[PDB]
Amino acid sequence: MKYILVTGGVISGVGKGVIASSFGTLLKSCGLDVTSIKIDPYINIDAGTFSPYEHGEVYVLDDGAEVDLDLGNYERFLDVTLHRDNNITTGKIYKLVIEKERTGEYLGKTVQVVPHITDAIQEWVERVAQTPVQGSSKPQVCIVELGGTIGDIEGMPFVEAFRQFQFRVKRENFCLAHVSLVPLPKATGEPKTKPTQSSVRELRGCGLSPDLIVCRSEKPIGLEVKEKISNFCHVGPDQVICIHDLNSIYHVPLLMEQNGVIEYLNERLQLNIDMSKRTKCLQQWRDLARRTETVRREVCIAVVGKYTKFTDSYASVVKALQHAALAVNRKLELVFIESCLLEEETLHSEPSKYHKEWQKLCDSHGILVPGGFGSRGMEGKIRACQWARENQKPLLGICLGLQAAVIEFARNKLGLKDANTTEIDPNTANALVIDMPEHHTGQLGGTMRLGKRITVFSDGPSVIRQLYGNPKSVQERHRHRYEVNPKYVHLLEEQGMRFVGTDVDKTRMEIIELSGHPYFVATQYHPEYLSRPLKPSPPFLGLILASVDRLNQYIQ
Amino acid sequence: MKYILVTGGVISGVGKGVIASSFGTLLKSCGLDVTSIKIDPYINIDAGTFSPYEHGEVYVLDDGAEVDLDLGNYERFLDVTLHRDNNITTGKIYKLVIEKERTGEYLGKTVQVVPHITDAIQEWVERVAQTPVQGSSKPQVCIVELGGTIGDIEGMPFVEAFRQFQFRVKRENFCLAHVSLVPLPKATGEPKTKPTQSSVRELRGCGLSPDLIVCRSEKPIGLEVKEKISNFCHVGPDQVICIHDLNSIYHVPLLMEQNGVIEYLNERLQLNIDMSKRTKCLQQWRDLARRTETVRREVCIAVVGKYTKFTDSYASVVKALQHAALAVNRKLELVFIESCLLEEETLHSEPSKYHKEWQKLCDSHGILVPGGFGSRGMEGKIRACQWARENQKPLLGICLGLQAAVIEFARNKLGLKDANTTEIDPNTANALVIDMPEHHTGQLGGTMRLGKRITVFSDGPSVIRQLYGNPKSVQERHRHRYEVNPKYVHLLEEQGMRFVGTDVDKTRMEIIELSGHPYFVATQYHPEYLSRPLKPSPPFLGLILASVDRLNQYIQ
Amino acid sequence: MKYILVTGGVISGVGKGVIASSFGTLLKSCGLDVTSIKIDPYINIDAGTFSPYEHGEVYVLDDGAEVDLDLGNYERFLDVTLHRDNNITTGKIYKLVIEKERTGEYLGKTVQVVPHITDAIQEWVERVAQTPVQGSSKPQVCIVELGGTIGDIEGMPFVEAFRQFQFRVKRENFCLAHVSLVPLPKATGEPKTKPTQSSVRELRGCGLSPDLIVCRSEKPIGLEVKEKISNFCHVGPDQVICIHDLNSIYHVPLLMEQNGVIEYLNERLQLNIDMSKRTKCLQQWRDLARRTETVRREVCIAVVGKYTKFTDSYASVVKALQHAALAVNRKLELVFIESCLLEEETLHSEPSKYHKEWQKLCDSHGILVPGGFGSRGMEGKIRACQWARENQKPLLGICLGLQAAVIEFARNKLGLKDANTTEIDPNTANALVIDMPEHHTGQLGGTMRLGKRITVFSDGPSVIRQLYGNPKSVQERHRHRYEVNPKYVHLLEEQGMRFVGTDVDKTRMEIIELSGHPYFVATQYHPEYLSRPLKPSPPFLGLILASVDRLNQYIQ
Ligand SMILES: O=P(O)(O)Oc1cc[n+]([C@@H]2O[C@H](COP(=O)(O)OP(=O)(O)OP(=O)(O)O)[C@@H](O)[C@H]2O)c(O)n1
Ligand SMILES: O=P(O)(O)Oc1cc[n+]([C@@H]2O[C@H](COP(=O)(O)OP(=O)(O)OP(=O)(O)O)[C@@H](O)[C@H]2O)c(O)n1
Ligand SMILES: O=P(O)(O)Oc1cc[n+]([C@@H]2O[C@H](COP(=O)(O)OP(=O)(O)OP(=O)(O)O)[C@@H](O)[C@H]2O)c(O)n1
Ligand SMILES: Nc1nc2c(ncn2[C@@H]2O[C@H](COP(=O)(O)OP(=O)(O)OP(=O)(O)O)[C@@H](O)[C@H]2O)c(=O)[nH]1
Ligand SMILES: Nc1nc2c(ncn2[C@@H]2O[C@H](COP(=O)(O)OP(=O)(O)OP(=O)(O)O)[C@@H](O)[C@H]2O)c(=O)[nH]1
Ligand SMILES: Nc1nc2c(ncn2[C@@H]2O[C@H](COP(=O)(O)OP(=O)(O)OP(=O)(O)O)[C@@H](O)[C@H]2O)c(=O)[nH]1
Ligand SMILES: Nc1ncnc2c1ncn2[C@@H]1O[C@H](COP(=O)(O)OP(=O)(O)O)[C@@H](O)[C@H]1O
Ligand SMILES: Nc1ncnc2c1ncn2[C@@H]1O[C@H](COP(=O)(O)OP(=O)(O)O)[C@@H](O)[C@H]1O
Ligand SMILES: Nc1ncnc2c1ncn2[C@@H]1O[C@H](COP(=O)(O)OP(=O)(O)O)[C@@H](O)[C@H]1O
Ligand SMILES: [Mg+2]
Ligand SMILES: [Mg+2]
Ligand SMILES: [Mg+2]
Ligand SMILES: [Mg+2]
Ligand SMILES: [Mg+2]
Ligand SMILES: [Mg+2]
Ligand SMILES: [Mg+2]
Ligand SMILES: [Mg+2]
Ligand SMILES: [Mg+2]
C-alpha cells in the first residue's frame, strides 16, 4: 500500500483538498485505484453543529455523515462514494480509546497519547485504506489530508502517529506534500517566504520531512523565490511545485502534469507506470478547462442567502450551477444578494442598500434560493420568492426556499397572514412548517433527517420529472429537521401549487411546482451533492435553460 | 526610565518601525523626551555589506554607521540624531562578549548565552536609553524595536534578555506591543487570524506577554475579527489596535490617537500627562496629512535605477522627493525605469520593452538618477544622462548619476570613447572614475568614505548654492568607495561642465553643474538623508521647481 | 568517510567520552584508522579560564591548547596526538564567521545561523576528519562527541548542522549514539526512564534519530526497563546498550563487545570486517582489566590539594598513579586531603578536622602535591612538604608543589621567613616565586607557558634521570604563568636542594631534588599528560616504588 500525506502551512483555506484531489486524479488517469481520507483535528464527531462561516458549507455523504467540503471535492474529481470512516477526528479517536479502556482492553497499563492514541490512528488509517470505495476495487494508493495548520495544539497526536507510520510502512511506500502560503503584501512589495520556512521548521520538529513543497500564491513567483524556498527549506528545486490562483480548479492537475509530478511519484513510490501508454490521460480535464474559457453567453443568476459574506458557504451550490451552465454552453455570472437587505427594516435605515440589492435582483435571469437555519434573513427570502412568483422569473429552491415559498404562497394567496415557521415562531396559529418529532430529541448532533432517501413522483407528467429522465424513482441526499405541514397540503393544492414528489409513504413533501409559471421548482433535499462536472443535476439544468429560454426546446 | 518594546509577528516588512516612530511622536507631542533603539538579530556588525534587495536601502548616520531604514524613520519623525550604539546586533554582542572572555572578566566561569549574552544586552540597553540624543535632554522613554519575526533562531537570546528585563525594571515601567499581519487571501475569502495567534503563542512561549496587539491589514477589519483576536490571544478589546494600509504614514499617529493609545500609555506607564493641555498636540501631522490630500498638480519624475524591482531600495530618495513636492504645493507622480531596458541589448531581444521604457522616460518632466554598485545597469544610466543633456530636461544625480554623467560627458564631448569606471573595467586607458586607495584595503566592511563631511563651494554664484541659502559651507552624509579622477577635471571644465563644490582640500570632487542647461545638478554625497517633512533638501527642491518651470521665480 | 556522533541526555558527566573512546578502540582493534573531534557549545575559545570545579581538570595538548579531559581519554585509549582543531566551540565558530563577514566573503547576503554557522561547522568537521592524526594515516572513521545536554540553548546550531550533515554524507556513512542517564532514586524505589524519553523527544525535535541508545546507571537494569526504553523511544531492543558503573573503564569496551556493538557497526556503516580474523582483538584491555582485579598490595598515597571536593579536578593525576601502581603490581589506595585543614586557622576553629587530616597524612606511604592557582590552600601545602622533608617520606610535586617546596625550603633552612609567592603577596621582600613578564600581558587566555617543551638535565647522575632512561632530553607539557626566582638558586643549591633540570637556555628551573632524602622530586611541568596504561610516567613510577621501598632494587 502507498500513502500520500498532504499537510498544511500558514493558514487553513490554503488549498490542500484541491491538491489532494489533483494527485488522486493524476494517479487514477495512469491506471491506479485511489482512496482518500480526511483528518480533522477538531473535537467534533462530525461537522453537523458548525456554522457555514466556520469551515465552509457542510457536505453530506450517502450514509448521512456531515463532513468537510474536501470530501465533496474528492467525490467530484475521482468519482467515488465515501463513508463516515473516511473522516477521522480527535473526538472519535478519544471516544473510541476511552471506551476500550473502560472495557479493559489495556488492563494493567496506563493509557496515554503515545502509544495508544497514535496506534488507534494508524490502525484506522490502515483499515480504511484497504477498503474498496468504487465497488470492490482494491485501492493501491491512499491520499490522506491532515486538516488545519502544522503547529495547532489539536493536531500534535496525528503528526506523531505518522512519524511512526513512515517507518511502519517502509519509506518507499510513504510520501509527504506540504502546502504553504507565499504572501505578497501590497505595502511590503515582495513575496514573503518566512511563513513557509517556519511551517517546515515546525514540521521537521515533529520527525517528518517533506518530499514535496507546494507553494500557493495569488500570482506566479519567480525562480528567485523558488531558489530561496529550496535552500532555506532543504528540498530540491524539482520538488517545489508552485500552484497559483487559477480561474477554475480543473487547471490544477494539468499544471501538476506540466511540472513533472507523475514522473516524481512514479520514481519515489515505485508505481511502475508505462508512460508511452499514459499520453492523453488528462483529456477530460483539458476539454473541461478549455470549454470553461470558450463560452461567451453570460447567463446571470441570483443567489439569495444569509451567509453571503463568505461565499464558500455555498460551494457545492455554486459548482452545481457551473456544471450546468457549461453543459448548456453558457457562461455563468453569479450575483450574491444578502436577504436582510430585501426587508423593509433596511428601507428605513439604509434605503440605498435596499434599492441597490433589489436592482440586482430584478436585473437577473434566474433565482436560486439556498438552504439555511434560524431566523436571520428569511423574511427577505420570502419576498424574493414572492417577486419571482408575481413576475414570472425562473426559480429553484433548496431545502429552505421550498419552505419560504410555501409560506409565501400561503400568506399571499390563501390570505394566511400568520403563515410562518416553527423555527421562528413555534406558537403560531397557522403553522405551515412544523417540527418532525423523530428528530427533535434535544440531542443536537446526528439528530437530522440525513443521507440518501428515495423519491417517488406523483402521477402526471412533470417538467422536473422529464429533466430526471422520466423515471419512477431517484435517490437524493437530505439534511433537515423541519417539514411542511401535511394538513395544509390540499389547501395549497387547490391553487397554483402542486406536490409532484414525496416519500415512499406519501406523507412527507419534498418537491413542489407552480403551474403556469415557467420554472418554480423547489426541493427539500439537496440536489447539489450529486452534481458532477460531466453529469450535471437536472434541477439546475432546468433553471439555467429557463433562464436562457431554452427549456421547452431541450425538452423536445 | 520607561520602555516600549515593539516586536513582530508573521513577516518582516510588517510595519514595526512606523509604529515605533508613531509612539515616539505621540509621546513627544505630549511633553516627553524619547529615544529609540533598533535590535537586528542578524550576524553583521552593520548593514554595509547588504544588497538593497535584502532589507531595503541602507541608511547612514552622521557618525558614519550603516543601519536599517527604521532609524531614518525615527530621525524623520522625532527630529533626532542617532549614533552607532542605537543599533544592536548579534555580531556586536558576541564580539564584545568574546573579547571580555579572552581578557578574563569572567575568570573561573563558563560563558554561556544565559546569563552573559542577555546581561550584555540589558546593560547596552540601559546604557543607551539614558544617553541624551537631541542635545543633553534627559530621555524619559525608550522605544526598542526588535527586528525579525518572533521564532527566528537568531532572536532567541534577545527575547530571553527582555523576559528578565521586565522584572529588572518593574513591570510598571515596561510595555510590549506586538505587530502582526492579518492576511486576506483572494481565494480564501476572509481575513485570517491564525498567524497572529501562532505568533502570540510563540511569544508567550518565551516568557513575554503583549500589552498591545497591532493588527496590520491592507483593508480595515470588522469587529468580528477583532473579537476573535482578543479572545484567542487573551488581551482586552481596547488593546487591539488595527492599523490598515494608508496613503501616507503621517496618518498612522493620528489613527493611533483616534484609538486611545495616549490614554492607555498614560495609564499603563504612569506618565502623568495633563490632557486638558494636550489638545492640538498633533496639529503638525494633521496639516501634513491634509496637504498631502489637497494637492492636484501632477509633477512626474523618473527614477532610473538598477534595484527598481523592489521600491524600498530607494525609500529615502522617494520620501525626499515627496517632502519637496508638498512644499512646492505639487503632487508627485513617480515613474520607476529599469536601466538595463534602456540599453541596446534589449532592442535586439525585447524591443517592445525598450521602446516602452524610453517612452516612459521621454514623457516625464524631470529625471533623478540614484546611487548603486557594480556594473549591472550603468550603460543605460549613461544614456539617460546623455538624453537629458541633449534634450534640456532637468536632472539630479546621486553618487552614481554623478559618475555616470561625468563618463557620459567625456565620451560624448571629449571624444573619449573608452571613458569608463574602474568598478567595471579597471584596466581602461581613460579612467574617469578611479579608486580611492585609502578605502580599498580588501577588508570590505566599514571601509568606505562614510558620514558627514564638509562642503565648500568654488567661487562664483551657483543656483545650487542659492538653493542652499548662499552659505560658505554645509555638512552632508557620504557613503562611497570610488571618486572622479582629478586629472581630467579641467579637460571637462573647459566645456559645459563646472565643479561648483569639493572638499576642504580642493582635490575631491563632490558636485558638478552644466551651464546653459536648466538644471543638471549632481552630488557624490547623499542629500536624501537629511531631508525632513518640514525641511526639504535643496537639490530635490530645485529639481521639482525646474520640473514645473518655477525655479527662476523661486530664486528671486 | 564514516562518522559516529555521540550525544548526551539528562546531565553532563554522563559518560559520553568513555563511550566514544570505547567505540574508537573497538574499531581500531579490528583494523580501522580512527580520529576524534570534541564539540563544546560554551562561548570560550579554550578552557584555560575555567576552574576545575566547572568541567574537571583542564587538559593540555602538545601544541598547547587547553581542552576538556575527553581528549585526554581519547589519547590514552587510542594512542593518538590531537591538535587545537579537534576541539570546536561556539566562540571559535562565531569569531571565524564574523571575520569572514567583515572581510566580504558573503557580500550582498544576510549572515544568519542557518546556513552560515551550520555550514562552517560542517566544513570544519569535514576538514579535520580527513586529517591524519597518528602519522600520515588516512582516517576512515571519525568519532564526534557533542558536549552538554540536548536541549541546551548553546548547542542548537550544532544539532541543526548535523541534521543536514546526515543527508550530505549519505545515511549509510553516519550513525548516532545517545547516552542517557537512568536514575534510581532511593525514595522512589525504581529505575526511572522518563528523562531518557524526554531527551530522545528533544533530539527528534531537531531532525535527528538515534541509531544506538546507551543507558547509564549505577547498577544493571532488568529487561523490563530495557523494553520500556525500546518501546517509548522507538528503537530495537538490540539497539539498547546498558553500561553500568564499573570498577575501571577498561571494562567498558569489553562490555560493548559483549553486547554486539562491533557487528552492529559493521552492518550499519558497512565496514567490511572479516571476523574469523578479529578474535583476540581486545586482549590488551582484557589483560589490563584482569590485572586491575588481581593486585593485593595496598600502597596508600596522599593527594594534598585545594580542589579535593571534586575529585575529577585531578583525573589525569589519579590515572597516572594507577598506571604506575599496576605496572609495579600494586593496588592503589588514594587519600584526598584538603590543604586548608592542615593550616593552624583550623586548629582554632575546628581542631577535630585538623587532627583527623594530619592523621590521614601521617599514616600514608607517599605524598603527591598537585598544581593549582591562587592563594586558597597553599599554606598547608607548604606544611605537607615541610613534614615530608623533616620525616623522610617520598614526595612528588607537580607545578605548584615545586614552588611550595622551594618556599618551604627557603623559610625553614635559609631563615627567610617572608619567602612567599607573587601570586599571594607581590610586594614581598624575598620573592622566591616571581612573574614571567612574557606571559603577564593582562590578556588572560592563551597567555601561558603552554605545550611541549624540551628538558635538559644538569650533569651528574640523578635518580629521576635514571627513571627517564638516562637520556639527554625529554619533551614534556607545560602550563604555567609564574617561575622560581633564578637569583636565589645557588642560595638553595648550597644546601640539600639541587636543580637537576632546566630549559635549553639554563635559566628557567623545572626540576629539583633533595639529597639524602629517599624521593623528593618536583616538576614544574605536568608529567601526568603523557602517562598511558602500558607506558607509565617515570616520576609516578619512582614515587610508587619509593612508597613500597622497591626503588633501589628497580634501579639496579
Ligand atoms: O525589517 P526589520 O525591521 O524587521 O529588521 C530585520 C529583518 C530581518 N532580520 C534578520 O535577517 C534574516 C532574514 O530576514 P527575513 O525576514 O527577511 O527572512 P527571509 O529569509 O529573507 O524570508 P522573507 O522572504 O520572508 O523575507 C533573519 O535572520 C532576520 O532575523 C533582522 O536581523 N532585522
Ligand atoms: O480546512 P481544512 O481542510 O484545513 O480542515 C480543518 C480546518 C481547521 N480545523 C480546526 O478548526 C480549528 C480552527 O481552525 P482555523 O484554521 O480556522 O483557526 P481560526 O481560529 O479560525 O483562525 P482563522 O481566521 O485563521 O481561520 C482548529 O482547531 C483547526 O485545527 C480542522 O480540524 N480541520
Ligand atoms: O505520581 P504523580 O503524583 O506524579 O501522578 C501521575 C504520574 C504519572 N501520570 C501519567 O502516567 C504516564 C506515565 O507516567 P510516568 O511518569 O511514570 O512515565 P513512565 O513511562 O512510566 O517512565 P518512568 O519509569 O520514569 O516512570 C504519563 O502520561 C503521566 O503523565 C499521571 O497522569 N499522574
Ligand atoms: N487480574 C485482574 N486485574 C484487575 C481486574 N480488575 C481490575 N484489575 C487491575 O488490573 C491490574 C492487572 O494488571 P497486571 O499487570 O496483569 O497485574 P495482575 O492483575 O496482578 O496480574 P499478574 O501480574 O499476572 O499477577 C490489576 O493489578 C488490578 O489492579 C481483574 O478483574 N483481574
Ligand atoms: N587564579 C588564577 N586563575 C587562572 C589564571 N589564569 C587562568 N586561570 C584559571 O581560572 C581559574 C580561576 O577560577 P577560581 O574559581 O577563582 O579558582 P582559583 O584560581 O584556584 O581561585 P580560588 O578558588 O580562590 O583558589 C583557575 O582555576 C584557572 O584554571 C590566573 O592567572 N590566576
Ligand atoms: N558591488 C559592491 N557592493 C558593495 C561593496 N561594498 C559594499 N557593498 C554592498 O554589497 C552589495 C552587493 O550585493 P549585490 O547583490 O552583488 O548587488 P550589487 O553590488 O549592486 O551587484 P549587482 O546586483 O550585480 O548589480 C551592494 O549592494 C552594496 O550595498 C563594493 O565594494 N562593491
Ligand atoms: N489553485 C487554486 N486557485 C483558485 N482557487 C483555489 C485554488 N486552490 C484552492 N482554491 C480554492 O480555495 C478554497 C480553499 O481550498 P480548500 O481545498 O478548501 O483548502 P483547505 O483544505 O486548505 O481549506 C476553495 O474554495 C478552493 O476551491
Ligand atoms: N500603515 C501603513 N500603511 C502603508 N504603508 C506602511 C504602513 N506601515 C508601514 N508601511 C510601509 O511598509 C514598509 C515596511 O515597514 P517597516 O517600518 O520597514 O517595517 P518593519 O520594520 O517590520 O520591516 C515601509 O515601506 C513602510 O513605509
Ligand atoms: N561506565 C562508567 N563507570 C564508571 N565511571 C564512569 C563510567 N563512564 C564514565 N565514568 C566516569 O564518569 C566521569 C564522567 O565521564 P565523562 O567521559 O567525562 O562524561 P561526559 O563527557 O558526559 O562529561 C569520568 O570520571 C568517567 O571516568
Ligand atoms: Mg478549509
Ligand atoms: Mg476559521
Ligand atoms: Mg443561530
Ligand atoms: Mg524591514
Ligand atoms: Mg528578506
Ligand atoms: Mg555584485
Ligand atoms: Mg564533563
Ligand atoms: Mg556544571
Ligand atoms: Mg581565584
Residue numbers in the entry:
A (entry chain B), B (entry chain A), C (entry chain C): 1 to 556
How does the study describe this entry?
Cytidine triphosphate synthase (CTPS) catalyzes the final and rate-limiting step of de novo CTP biosynthesis, in which a UTP is converted into CTP with the consumption of an ATP and a glutamine. A CTPS protein comprises two domains, the N-terminal ammonia ligase (AL) domain and the C-terminal glutamine amidotransferase (GAT) domain. While the active site at the AL domain activates UTP by phosphorylation using ATP to generate an iminophosphate intermediate that can react with ammonia to yield CTP, the GAT domain mediates the hydrolysis of glutamine to yield NH3 with GTP as allosteric activator. The nascent ammonia is delivered through an “ammonia tunnel,” which connects the active sites at both domains, to complete the reaction.
To reveal the structure of dmCTPS bound by all ligands without completing the reaction (dmCTPS+Sub), we used DON as a glutamine substitute for cryo-EM. We selected 424,195 particles of full-length dmCTPS in the mixture of 10 mM Mg2+, 2 mM ATP, 2 mM UTP, 2 mM GTP, and 6 μM DON. In our dmCTPS+Sub model, the binding mode of DON shows high consistency with glutamine binding in prokaryotic CTPS models, and the covalent bond between Cys399 and DON is observed, indicating that the glutamine binding site is active for the reaction of the thiol nucleophile. The GTP binding site is located at a cleft between the GAT and AL domain, which is similar to the predicted GTP binding position in ecCTPS. At the GTP binding site, the guanine base of GTP interacts with Leu444 of the binding monomer and Leu107 of another monomer through dispersion interactions and forms three hydrogen bonds with the side chain of Arg481. Yet, stabilized by the interaction between Leu444 and GTP, the wing is rather rigid in our dmCTPS+Sub map. However, when GTP is positioned at the binding site, the cleft between the glutaminase active site and the ammonia tunnel is fully covered by GTP, suggesting that GTP serves as a block to prevent molecules shuttling between the interior and exterior spaces of the protein. In our dmCTPS+Sub map, we observe additional electron density merging with the uracil base in the direction of the 4-oxygen atom, which would be phosphorylated in the reaction. Meanwhile, the signal of the γ-phosphate of ATP is missing, suggesting that the reaction of UTP phosphorylation is taking place in our imaging condition. We further focused on residues participating in this transformation and identified Lys16 and Lys38 directly interact with transferred phosphate and Asp70 and Glu145 also interact through a water molecule, supporting previous predictions about their function of stabilizing the anionic transition state during the reaction.
